[PDB]
Amino acid sequence: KVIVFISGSCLFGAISRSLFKKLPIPYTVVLLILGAILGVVASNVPLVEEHTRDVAHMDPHVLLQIFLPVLIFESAFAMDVHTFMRSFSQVCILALFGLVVASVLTAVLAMNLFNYNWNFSEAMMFGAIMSATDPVAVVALLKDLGASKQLGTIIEGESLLNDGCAIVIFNVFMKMVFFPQLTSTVGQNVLYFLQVAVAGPLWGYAVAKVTVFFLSHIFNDALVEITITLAATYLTYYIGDIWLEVSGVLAVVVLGLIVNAEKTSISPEVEVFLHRFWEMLAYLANTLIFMMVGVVVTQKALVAVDKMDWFYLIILYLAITIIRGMVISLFSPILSRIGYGLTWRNAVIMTWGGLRGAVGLALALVVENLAGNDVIGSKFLFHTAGIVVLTLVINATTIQTLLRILGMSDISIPKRLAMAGAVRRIHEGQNRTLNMLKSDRFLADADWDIATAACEISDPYSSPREFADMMEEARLRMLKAEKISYWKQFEHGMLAREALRLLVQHAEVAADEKDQFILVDDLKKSWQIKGIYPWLKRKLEDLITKALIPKLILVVNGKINNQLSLGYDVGKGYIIGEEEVGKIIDRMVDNKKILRELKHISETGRLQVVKELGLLQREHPGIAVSVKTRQAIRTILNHSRETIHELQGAGLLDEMEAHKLELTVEIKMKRLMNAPSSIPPPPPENLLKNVSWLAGDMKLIDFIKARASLLHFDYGEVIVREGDESDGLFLIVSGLVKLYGKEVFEDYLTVGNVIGEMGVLTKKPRNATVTCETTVQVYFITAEDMNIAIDTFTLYPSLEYRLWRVVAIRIATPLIMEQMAFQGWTQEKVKLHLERGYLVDLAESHFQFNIDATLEDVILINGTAYNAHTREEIRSPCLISRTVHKLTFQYTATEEPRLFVVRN
Amino acid sequence: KVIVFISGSCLFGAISRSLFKKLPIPYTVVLLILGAILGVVASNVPLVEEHTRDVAHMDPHVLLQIFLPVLIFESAFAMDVHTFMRSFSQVCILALFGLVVASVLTAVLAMNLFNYNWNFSEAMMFGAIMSATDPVAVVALLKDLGASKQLGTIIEGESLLNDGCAIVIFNVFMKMVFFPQLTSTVGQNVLYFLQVAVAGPLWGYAVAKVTVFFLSHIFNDALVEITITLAATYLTYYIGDIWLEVSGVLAVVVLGLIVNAEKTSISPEVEVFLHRFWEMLAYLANTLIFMMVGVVVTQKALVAVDKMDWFYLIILYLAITIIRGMVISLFSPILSRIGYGLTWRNAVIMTWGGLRGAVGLALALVVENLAGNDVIGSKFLFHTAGIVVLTLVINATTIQTLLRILGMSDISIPKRLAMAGAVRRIHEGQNRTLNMLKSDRFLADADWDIATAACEISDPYSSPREFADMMEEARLRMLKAEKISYWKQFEHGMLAREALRLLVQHAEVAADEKDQFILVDDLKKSWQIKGIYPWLKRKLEDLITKALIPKLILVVNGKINNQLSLGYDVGKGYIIGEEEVGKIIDRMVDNKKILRELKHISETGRLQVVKELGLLQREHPGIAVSVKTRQAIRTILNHSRETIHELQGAGLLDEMEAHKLELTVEIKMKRLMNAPSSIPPPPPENLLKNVSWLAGDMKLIDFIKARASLLHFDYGEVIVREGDESDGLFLIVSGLVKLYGKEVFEDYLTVGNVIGEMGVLTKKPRNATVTCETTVQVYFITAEDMNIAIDTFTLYPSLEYRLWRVVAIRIATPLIMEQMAFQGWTQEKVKLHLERGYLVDLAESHFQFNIDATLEDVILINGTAYNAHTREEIRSPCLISRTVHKLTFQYTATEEPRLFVVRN
Numbered sequence A, B: 001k002v003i004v005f006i007s008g009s010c011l012f013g014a015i016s017r018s019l020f021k022k023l024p025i026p027y028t029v030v031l032l033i034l035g036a037i038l039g040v041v042a043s044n045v046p047l048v049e050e051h052t053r054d055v056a057h058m059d060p061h062v063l064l065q066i067f068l069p070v071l072i073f074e075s076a077f078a079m080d081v082h083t084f085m086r087s088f089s090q091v092c093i094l095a096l097f098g099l100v101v102a103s104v105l106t107a108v109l110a111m112n113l114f115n116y117n118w119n120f121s122e123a124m125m126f127g128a129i130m131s132a133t134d135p136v137a138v139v140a141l142l143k144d145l146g147a148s149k150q151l152g153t154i155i156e157g158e159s160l161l162n163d164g165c166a167i168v169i170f171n172v173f174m175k176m177v178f179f180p181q182l183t184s185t186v187g188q189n190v191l192y193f194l195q196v197a198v199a200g201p202l203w204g205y206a207v208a209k210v211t212v213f214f215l216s217h218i219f220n221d222a223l224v225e226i227t228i229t230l231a232a233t234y235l236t237y238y239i240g241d242i243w244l245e246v247s248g249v250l251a252v253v254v255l256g257l258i259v260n261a262e263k264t265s266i267s268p269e270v271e272v273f274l275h276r277f278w279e280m281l282a283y284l285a286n287t288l289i290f291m292m293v294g295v296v297v298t299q300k301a302l303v304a305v306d307k308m309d310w311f312y313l314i315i316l317y318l319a320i321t322i323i324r325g326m327v328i329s330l331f332s333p334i335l336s337r338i339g340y341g342l343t344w345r346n347a348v349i350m351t352w353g354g355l356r357g358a359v360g361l362a363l364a365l366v367v368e369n370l371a372g373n374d375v376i377g378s379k380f381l382f383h384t385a386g387i388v389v390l391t392l393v394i395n396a397t398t399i400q401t402l403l404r405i406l407g408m409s410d411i412s413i414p415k416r417l418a419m420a421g422a423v424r425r426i427h428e429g430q431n432r433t434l435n436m437l438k439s440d441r442f443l444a445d446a447d448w449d450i451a452t453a454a455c456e457i458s459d460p461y462s463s464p465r466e467f468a469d470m471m472e473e474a475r476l477r478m479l480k481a482e483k484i485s486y487w488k489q490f491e492h493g494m495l496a497r498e499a500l501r502l503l504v505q506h507a508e509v510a511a512d513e514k515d516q517f518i519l520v521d522d523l524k525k526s527w528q529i530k531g532i533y534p535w536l537k538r539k540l541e542d543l544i545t546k547a548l549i550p551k552l553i554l555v556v557n558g559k560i561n562n563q564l565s566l567g568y569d570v571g572k573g574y575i576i577g578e579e580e581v582g583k584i585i586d587r588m589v590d591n592k593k594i595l596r597e598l599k600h601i602s603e604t605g606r607l608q609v610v611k612e613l614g615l616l617q618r619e620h621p622g623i624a625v626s627v628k629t630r631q632a633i634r635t636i637l638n639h640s641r642e643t644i645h646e647l648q649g650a651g652l653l654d655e656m657e658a659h660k661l662e663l664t665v666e667i668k669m670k671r672l673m674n675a676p677s678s679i680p681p682p683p684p685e686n687l688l689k690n691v692s693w694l695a696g697d698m699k700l701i702d703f704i705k706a707r708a709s710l711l712h713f714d715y716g717e718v719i720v721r722e723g724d725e726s727d728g729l730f731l732i733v734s735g736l737v738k739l740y741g742k743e744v745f746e747d748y749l750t751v752g753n754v755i756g757e758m759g760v761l762t763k764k765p766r767n768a769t770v771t772c773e774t775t776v777q778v779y780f781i782t783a784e785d786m787n788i789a790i791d792t793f794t795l796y797p798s799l800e801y802r803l804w805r806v807v808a809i810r811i812a813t814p815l816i817m818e819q820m821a822f823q824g825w826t827q828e829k830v831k832l833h834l835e836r837g838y839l840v841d842l843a844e845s846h847f848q849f850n851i852d853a854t855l856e857d858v859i860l861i862n863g864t865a866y867n868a869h870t871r872e873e874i875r876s877p878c879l880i881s882r883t884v885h886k887l888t889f890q891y892t893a894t895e896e897p898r899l900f901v902v903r904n
């Protein structure tokens, strides 16, 4: 029976972990102490052994085959993959250097200390045991303190490589030692080394790729993805183990880091459930193994205790600390030379960053059980248990005190100021809500002292050199204002998460250096296509059965395209940022020279950044249109979600249907996320011109031979000025313009509109000024082209009637929104319901039209009319009231009357 | 080796669920078909048996000990406990009657059909097999259709009791049959029946209570509770099994229904993760066992196949359908008589609601494996496999077609109308957002036809008799009008989930009957304390070591209080509802007599509902104050969460601190759940008068003895009328009043204020009219008591200073909000910063006060003043400008001058 032992183990771990949270020490030593407690009954009363002897002696196979894979997999499952791959090369080379030197320096101290009959193999055993690492406690406490993000992820990163290489070296040397009958030739050894090296990782890569491709074909299902993920993970581990006894751990590590690298094709509930399940398994295993070593070491290491061994325990700690500090200090210059160097504070927290854990204890138990009836294994356990308990119990306190005195974990002034402002905002919000609650007529019998005292909220926190200090304060104000503007810019759905993280990383590293601002060379290389990728691009485009080659090449290009997309929008963000510079920095500033130099560097950055964006869009337009479409879809769907949540909160519908509406918009989200990243070609300009307006006339296709200029106007170029003679005409084909006219009005004209309408109709000069806020492509149309079009209309003036209706809309809408006869009319209503209309020719009516009940809206566009009863001479563009039912018009060649009629 | 079989089972189940989910048939038969597929290779190629013989013959013990508990537990875990206990007695007694009559009517058909050497024991075997039920597919399809919640939950309800009683009867009869050496005396049988009937569930009740009490002591820890809940469930099952081989299933059922009945003391992530985990385990077991039976039945039932057996499988289907329909039809009148009758549509869908599942197949395999080398077990398996495969596949189609033709699952007109209105609201919102986005100067190069084509959204759906029809339409308009008002009224956090569910159930059952409105007798018994509970309350009040008795009695009272709170709460909701009736029903109505009779019946309902609410307040006030405080806490917390979400959306802070803020509001929420349902005593108003206003002066203690009227004024009672002589004075002690005064103003006055100040100070008649909108308790203070107060003022008139400051604020605040010298001043600011003030006696200054820079605010409360330079005769209550620096006052006994001064 083993039920009582494991159940009590779970209960003891639960109570200890829950209780011992106030102190900064990890709870695990309590478990260890509990094991030592069992030691005393492990010497006295037989009832405990007969209930614990079966669990006291697991076969080593179950330990090395079950506990190691799950712990190593969990250590590799909670990673931030993007931050890890930001600096993967540096951390892996530093980790491999550290582990090889820590392994090789153990032999000299082993021979200088013990002077026993211990070969180099025993030294390798000891070095493999002592080099294990555990980052859980330190990363948990630094998240509790919130010092830095890249620090925590690299700290949790290198422990994976340390543990993997340690178990590899241990296991090969262990097969060398305890089974000497095996072949130990150099050729077989290098074959074993290379085999797994090149295979296990690629085997895991292949299985991860095929399982994520299979997972990509699942929509709105709940069970199959978890079932298939668990099955794939186990099958990968089993195949890896049956191939090589060692390679399974590396295979599951690579599988975990790949599957954690994908989040877009899997629903959020799936990975939060998977994270919870795996973390629970790891916690259970950790508690069990720590209590296990605690109970076994007391009964085992009772006879090998010695004072010289205690002195050895004292000196191995100083040895490991000094060698780790020395190696990180001497490879610090190499880290500085590569361009990813860290500060001396980062070095000194690297000095105390080491922490052993469960994996070293596991390897200790398994090497004991392979050792068998010998005092040497008990010696190993005594050393490793002593060193791990002392190193963690003093390491936690030392790092806590070190960050206390050095104070890199202290929060900054801007963030605590913002937190205090938020607290005060919440305070007066609840104050005014309470004041509203006072006036209610149904809650007057309730007291308020307990109500206020139970709902309080508080923050958890609680000379030229003068010119330099004040400009430093000013740059701090500028940087906090810009990053909060960046957050606001991204919260309306207008940016991407990766773009946000890269941009705030750039801002933070720019602000870290003294008197250093945001710079663009980092942005330049962020959008620049460097590395071996252009080399392989040139190779693939030069070399181009056969069917496998081209398809992959396509998505290969897409990868590069994806990169460029990110670059484009991050530059886009900076534009908005510098836009805020133009509208914020003029208020909190107090000095003139500092203000003007900050403005000056602002312009210089702006003019430096506009040009390369212009060239990248001028050579690669499909990327621009694709990311713009992604932008538009993201923002409109985000606002749709916000307004459906508002309508739910408005109480106009129950939440049961809202629970399906959110599913509908969620499947729309995940359809968007798997966007056609393959770049769609921009639509043809002539095709867009044909689509934009109902050009049913074939002479309009013949008008392409009369209207084909493709003229470009750059930023700020005024096209026409008011008062100029109406000679030309323009059709916009690329860009957006702003028109100012005369009260006064401002309009925005996009692609697909005609300009110069009144100058041809009324033969009047220019009256409104148009400006272009970007490079714009336009077609040039002459007055001779207008005459040719008028000839082409012949019996049926299609475009003439269409433009008459259009100009009627542009005249009517301001007076509709201004007059009291139309109040509450929206832009869409006046742009949609007014389209159903036509014109009446006055030649057939002898310039005498009778208004009846069928007519609903009559607007005089041009000409002068007279009332048939009061002889009221009215002129354009006054709106005609419904009182008049008959009008008289004079046939004037200089000003032909124009009227619009709307039927019922 | 068995890895390949189970892995292939997982893959085949996943691919079948992915590929067949479009059709309304369950995927399970597909699995069954795949089992038959294996059958053919199970005859020919030896490579499959050697890969499946180890899994072809599991020991029956592991099946009956593993697969049954997890399946029955999962059937008991996804339940809705409140609707389950709404009609527990009815559903359990009907389930018991149905299962016993299904059992006993199998022997007659067994003897009339087989005519074999089968004892009554074989008949009970068959009846235990065939009576199993499985509601998963039918509840899934009806929840896809969304016909009725109570129907689906009760149909999921009875299957648990059916399966539990079936496995109990099977197991006792199997122990009787295959092990005849056991004792079969009546005494031992009845002892076993008693120890499985009542001794079982109480053990699970005790373990659930102790584990939830243990769980209640942990706040903000997301790991320990999972690893303790799973251990508790496993130990419960193990102890239940070792105590008795049968009762373990009943114990785990009762544990599941208790733990699912608690949600408040456990974080939501815990139960969503636990539901996902357990449901995944049950799905995996179901798939495995169905593939198992599909493989085994082909090789086993190949030799016993016969056509007359096929006729038998035809006739058993008809037998079960006719007996089930007959028994439910003949116990329908008991349901009608008990007050929980169902419609004939409910009866006819109850006829076809039967559906077998995995449990019957499990019992079939285990009875075969106990049978061993015999043809009778293969006979059993052939019958049960054939009947389940025909019944489920044609039952799904028949119920689908039946709901298609009868149309109880057709959605109503109002809800689809509301869905269409919401769709048009979403459409106009996205239209205006698109119009706004068109004007941007950064997205001009983006097309819109794919953009519009990627954001479409649509609904998933697509004479006196005339007087009766139109009043039916009017009452439908009314009922939707109120229920949407009820949803809105809950949405601001002003209700409770249980009260909402009970109220909407009452509204739905009121709307179910034709021309029937909402009633109050149902509401009356909803808040009425009936049953055996008041009888045991009387017994416990009569009867009252010793220490165990009183404490439980206390929480016993608390349970009663809980019920009353809900009653009070639901009553409050109806008041809001009737308020909406006063402001809605007057606009869609078109007829006069229907409108006036609806108003009349509404008012009769109002006058009927106010009186019992008033009494339940008058004998039990502490419940009222407790629920009012709970309401206040709920609404302020909800609005604080909304405004912190808005401030996040305003782009003023990042989400990392928002995580801490939502953690803080969630711990405040669970502290609200920690608020004692035990009723706090109402505060003693005479004792609390010192808290309401400073009563440290002993003359105020004497004034407490001066006036102790405690008079009650009912609803709508005007206390004083304007123009009446100033004879008395009032201090409110319980209630809220509305004061209308003269521009004109409306004020709301609560407990803790003094009225009638101007009638004593200025000796003027009443100018404003006060009304009380409820029953109010007040103290009567005379003008002779005002002369006693004149004696009390003495040298230092502190109470006079306080009331002078109060009336100064009263005069100033509308003047502050109206004058242009104070723009943007809030009520809190003018009520807080103006408190730091005092008065200066003009007698010591000879009625000549000099204004300096120290003074900041000067307001003339009363009297007439004159300027020292311009001789400007100014009078109260005009605000004094800062231009005047000296004033003269005339000593007049009729109107003594009074001014308020504020120091800097």
Ligand SMILES: C[C@@H]1CC[C@@]2(OC1)O[C@H]1[C@@H](O)[C@H]3[C@@H]4CC[C@H]5C[C@@H](O[C@@H]6O[C@H](CO)[C@H](O[C@@H]7O[C@H](CO)[C@@H](O)[C@H](O[C@@H]8OC[C@@H](O)[C@H](O)[C@H]8O)[C@H]7O[C@@H]7O[C@H](CO)[C@H](O)[C@H](O[C@@H]8O[C@H](CO)[C@@H](O)[C@H](O)[C@H]8O)[C@H]7O)[C@H](O)[C@H]6O)[C@H](O)C[C@]5(C)[C@H]4CC[C@]3(C)[C@H]1[C@@H]2C
Residues within 6 Å of the ligand: A001, A002, A006, A054, A058, A062, A066, A284, A285, A288
């Ligand atoms: C994933 C996470 C991590 C943690 C965890 O999951 C979650 O991991 C899981 C996994 O990792 C599990 C382990 C996997 C490996 C398992 C190996 C298993 O060994 C085998 O277990 C068999 C079970 O039927 C037999 O052994 C019996 O085991 C019972 C349980 O302890 C004893 O109860 C019984 O003995 C009886 O009671 C005790 C004594 O009175 C007598 O021995 C006898 O009356 C034994 O019976 C066996 O048969 C004979 C008697 O009937 C011999 O006595 C023999 O003993 C011999 O000598 C040794 C013992 O002295 C034994 O090792 C050897 O084989 C034998 O020849 C003995 O075993 C068998 O025989 C033995 O091999 C062991 O039981 C449990 C075991 C460790 C598991 C324990 C629980 C775990 C950790 C789980 C744990 C929760």
Ligand SMILES: Nc1ncnc2c1ncn2[C@@H]1O[C@@H]2COP(=O)(O)O[C@H]2[C@H]1O
Residues within 6 Å of the ligand: A726, A739, A741, A747, A754, A755, A756, A757, A758, A759, A760, A764, A765, A766, A767, A768, A810, A811
């Ligand atoms: N209200 C208006 N809205 C949009 N465009 C206008 C409006 N009024 C005038 N225009 C355009 O501005 C042009 C200015 O010169 P034209 O008169 O040649 O032709 C005019 C029209 O094309």
Ligand SMILES: Nc1ncnc2c1ncn2[C@@H]1O[C@@H]2COP(=O)(O)O[C@H]2[C@H]1O
Residues within 6 Å of the ligand: B726, B741, B747, B754, B755, B756, B757, B758, B759, B760, B764, B765, B766, B767, B768, B810, B811
């Ligand atoms: N602006 C005000 N706000 C609140 N209460 C007032 C206001 N003006 C007058 N009152 C009260 O209304 C009472 C009406 O009669 P009295 O003049 O006796 O005393 C008066 C005050 O108590």
